[PDB]
Amino acid sequence: LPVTVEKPTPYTFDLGLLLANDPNPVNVPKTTDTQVLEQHLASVARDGAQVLINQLLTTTTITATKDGVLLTLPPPTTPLPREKPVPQPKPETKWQAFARRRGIKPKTREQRRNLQYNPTTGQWERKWGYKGANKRGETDPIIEVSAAKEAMRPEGTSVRGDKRREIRARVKKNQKQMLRNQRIAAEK
């Protein structure tokens, strides 16, 4: 018994999706006999599966690894629609446009690290974040206070929250700028 079939029009294959297209007509018998109908359908299915396994075992590279015997498949060729549009570059923000105009180069990853060496303590510390350098002295035992600055200081406030106040102001300004950028990008 053979393992190769003969048809007037040859099969076409897409081994990326494990797909076989048989353009020959399926001569379905014009009867109501279910078992011979399913026999003919199973014969067509058997022919398609046979030629598909033959193509996989012949035109694909076979590699035996510890996982098992693998066939290397080509990338798929049958066109199928995407579920989402192809991503596009985001619209340039105000800073990105200004840097492109002024030739401002992006900072390197080593340069933008959250780490610096404090000489006076002789230790390594963070510039920002938890226990960062931007909040230096909020937990210090003794803080020098200027007399004029303390006189101009409002009642109830202390020197220990001035750095947090400046951080809140800078965060508010950065947040307003990024909200403006998001609104402009939404309009665009």
Binding site: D67, V69, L70
Partner: protein, 286 residues
């Protein structure tokens, strides 16, 4: 107010049947069966380990769409064929059950006409790959010295590739990150149970007799457990498919069908239900 009203019963959404029965952790099951590092379309096997009061159940399971399939199964009550009649739920019996399942899997695979596509596409530089499966403990707590790891240790010694570490074996020391293989050997050959028998025979004779009445009745001393378990391992590795018959009553399948149908209570039909409804209506009228 009544919380269990018509709105509550209509809005109520039942869980899965096995979750209601408290037998399946579906959150862990989904990651066990539908998650793979590689997408090579390969079948996956799991060693399912379960424990009862009197038995240990070990199965080799694949997951299909209409229900799971059992490739091979081993039970702790089958160790009576290999000479173990007492302590069928201890850690050594867990090891023996896992070893028996591993040997049965290898014997079924032939690693101890129709043919495979692997043999069809095998190349010249091809070697035999070990059989691989993942451990399924279910709802059991995976602590140090648990018997699910004894089953897994027995199967891995028997020849099934189960990916695992050694920090949950009995004898592992957590601060030194080392495993005491003397304690592991003692647990494999049942030295913990033997030490328990000696300690009870020295301290509390009555508790010794009550706990090990079957051991004294069958004349199984503490010092014979190591040689007994090694001897049982030798026959497990020799003949993994040895038939064992129990002391339960033996009948054929049709005889058991008749015996259970004799004790079935039949469901009453529509005519009987209508007759009972009419009788209840007549009783209410009278």
């Amino acid at each position: 107010k009544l919380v269990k009203n018509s709105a509550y019963y209509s809005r109520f959404q039942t869980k899965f049947k096995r979750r209601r029965q408290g037998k399946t952790d579906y959150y862990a099951r989904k990651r066990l069966i539908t998650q793979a590092k590689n997408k090579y379309n390969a079948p996956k096997y799991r060693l399912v380990v379960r424990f009862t009061n009197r038995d240990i159940i070990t199965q080799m399971v694949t997951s299909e769409i209409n229900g799971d399939k059992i490739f091979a199964a081993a039970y702790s009550h089958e160790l009576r064929a290999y000479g173990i009649n007492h302590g069928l739920t201890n850690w050594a019996a867990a090891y023996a059950t896992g070893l028996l399942l591993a040997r049965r899997v290898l014997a079924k695979l032939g690693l101890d006409g129709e043919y495979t596509l692997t043999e069809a596409a095998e190349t010249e530089d091809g070697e035999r790959r070990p059989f691989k499966a993942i451990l399924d403990v279910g709802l059991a707590r995976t602590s140090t010295g648990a018997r699910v790891f004894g089953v897994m240790k027995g199967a891995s010694d028997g020849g099934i590739f189960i990916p695992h570490s050694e920090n949950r074996f009995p004898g592992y020391d957590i601060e030194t990150e080392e495993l005491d293989t003397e304690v592991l050997k003692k647990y494999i050959y049942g030295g913990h149970v033997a030490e328990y028998m000696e300690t009870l025979a020295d301290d509390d004779e009555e508790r010794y007799k009550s706990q090990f009445v079957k051991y004294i009745e069958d004349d199984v001393e503490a010092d014979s457990l190591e040689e007994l378990y090694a001897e049982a391992h030798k026959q497990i590795r020799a003949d993994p498919f040895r038939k064992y018959v129990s002391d339960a009553p033996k009948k054929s399948k049709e005889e058991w069908k008749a015996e259970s149908l004799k004790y079935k209570k039949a469901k009453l039909s529509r005519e009987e239900r209508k007759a009972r409804v009419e009788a209840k209506i007549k009783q209410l009228l009278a």
